């Protein structure tokens, strides 16, 4: 299928409390594999996946050197924006970026990302033509115009076609085994008593990976789209994820309902029932 | 051409004294400023790449000792002391460390030629 | 030591094809620009190539890139009185601060 290499960058200014906080975090197909945090002592580029340790000591010196440069870059960016928006030098603000690429299974460059956001809102991003930019507000037009002057798009296009695509291939070569791991969910239903003649049936899905999953309750052939309570998938904190869907039902009539768990790691969708 | 303004273009140096070169950045879209030297046998070599004010770095080489400092967002300084032999110095600017100014590659001016005594 | 070209000197009859070699040791180098220096002023870009390509043609110049062997070459096909100058072969790696230059190759095209 498709794969991608993306970087989530953050630069948050803290008034008086010292210089700004800077971070870079890499993801290969949605999995963190590297991280540079300007706070931990000896701010360096650390691998975040055992498979990244096969990188020479030279890979990390260089990435660290580059990160420290990018960092100086964002201290400037922070000050600059304080200017465009006319915001006192006292506040605490945030710049975030998502830079990377997504290439299909045919090796073709599906998508190249270069998005900036200021204080939680879109600021400026590169269009799908990898040729033009989209400004989010009046401020971002200043940036847009500067970047069109300098030919920043040609710079990014060069990166996307060389470095991005090329190292995504390498990271994938070293990560294959680990990245394609798939833990099927273990599911069960719990019985809880609601006020009067009613009960809550809860379907639990545990220890699965990747996070993508779908749980549905069934009242004889139909799906309870309406009255179904269900939590946002959450991490167990050990590599896997959890989730549950619960439905309120008439006491004694619990057998009329069935839970269904659809996961990519399952040979076939699971069918669940409240077991006394 | 004309992103930087480097002076003088040619210069003489009393072998006991040090020299102070200065580079003035014209367009600010290319913050990254560097120093390259071409020695008498024609070998070009990167010396420094500074980005922000307050930055100072000393690097010593066969023929000269160096001290580069980024004084402001437009002024990059280089003082060359103990200059035993001749070398010609070039100042450059770029968008990012691994890119040119508005172009993919670094651009060199006429530089400043330094002939001893 | 990172980049090194050869031969350091070369002469060729006008209308003839001069050929300059170059080689490097950092397999991470992704950009290779060739600069043309005429006695008197700074190095000026002549022709460049990206590691993702293996051939770059512009006018009478041609870069041959062999990513496998870490070797490139410039072909000044149909030389000329003027093409005479010193030719540097440079290289760099993504995120790198410096541009590494080869030791140069002086070329003289005598009519």
């Amino acid at each position: 299928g498709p794969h991608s290499l993306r970087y989530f960058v953050t630069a948050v200014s803290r008034p008086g409390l010292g210089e700004p906080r800077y971070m870079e975090v890499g993801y290969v197909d949605d999995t963190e594999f590297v991280r540079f945090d300007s706070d931990a002592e000896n701010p360096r580029y650390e691998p975040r996946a055992r498979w990244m340790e096969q990188e020479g000591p030279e890979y990390w010196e260089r990435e660290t050197q580059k990160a420290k440069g990018n960092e100086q870059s964002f201290r400037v960016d922070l000050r600059t924006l304080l200017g465009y928006y006319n915001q006192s030098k006292g506040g605490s603000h945030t710049i975030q970026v998502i830079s990377g690429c997504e290439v299909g299974s045919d090796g073709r460059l599906l998508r190249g990302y270069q998005q900036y956001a200021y204080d939680g809102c879109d600021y400026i991003a590169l269009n799908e033509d990898l040729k033009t930019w989209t400004a989010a507000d009046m401020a971002a037009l200043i940036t847009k115009h500067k970047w069109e002057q300098a030919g920043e798009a040609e710079r990014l296009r060069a990166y996307l076609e060389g470095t991005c695509v090329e190292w995504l291939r390498r990271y994938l070569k070293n990560g294959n085994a680990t990245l394609l791991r798939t833990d099927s969910p273990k599911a069960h239903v719990t019985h809880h008593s609601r006020p009067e003649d009613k009960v809550t049936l809860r379907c639990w899905a545990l220890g699965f990976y990747p996070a993508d999953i779908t749980l549905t309750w069934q009242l004889n052939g139909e799906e309870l789209i309406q009255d179904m309570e269900l939590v946002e998938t959450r991490p167990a904190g050990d590599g896997t994820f959890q989730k549950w869907a619960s439905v309120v039902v008439p006491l004694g009539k619990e057998q009329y309902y069935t839970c269904h768990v659809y996961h990519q790691g399952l040979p076939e969708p699971l069918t669940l029932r409240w077991e006394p | 051409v004309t992103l930087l303004e480097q002076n003088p273009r040619w210069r003489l140096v009393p072998r006991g004294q040090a020299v102070n070169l200065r580079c003035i950045l014209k367009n600010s879209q290319y913050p990254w400023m560097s120093w390259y030297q071409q020695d008498l046998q024609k070998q070009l070599q990167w010396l420094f790449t500074l980005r922000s004010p307050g930055d100072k770095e000393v690097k010593s080489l066969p023929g000269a000792d160096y001290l580069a400092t980024r004084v402001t967002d437009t002024e990059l300084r280089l003082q060359v002391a103990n200059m035993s032999q001749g070398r010609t110095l070039y100042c450059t600017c770029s968008a990012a460390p691994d890119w040119g100014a508005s172009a993919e590659t670094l651009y060199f001016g006429s530089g400043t030629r330094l002939t001893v005594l | 030591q990172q980049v090194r070209q050869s031969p350091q000197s070369l002469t060729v009859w006008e209308g003839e094809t001069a050929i300059l070699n170059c080689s490097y040791e950092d397999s991470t180098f992704n950009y290779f620009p060739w600069y043309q220096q005429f006695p008197g002023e700074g190095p000026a870009l002549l022709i460049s190539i990206r590691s993702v390509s293996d051939k770059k043609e512009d006018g009478r110049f041609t870069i041959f890139f062999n990513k496998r062997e870490k070797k490139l070459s410039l072909h000044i096909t149909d030389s000329q009185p003027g093409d005479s100058a010193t030719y540097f072969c440079a290289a760099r790696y993504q995120g790198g601060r410096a541009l590494i230059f080869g030791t140069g190759t002086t070329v003289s095209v005598s009519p």
Partner: peptide
């Protein structure tokens, strides 16, 4: 490998 970022 993360790209190098310019200025806003």
């Amino acid at each position: 490998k993360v790209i190098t970022f310019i200025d806003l």
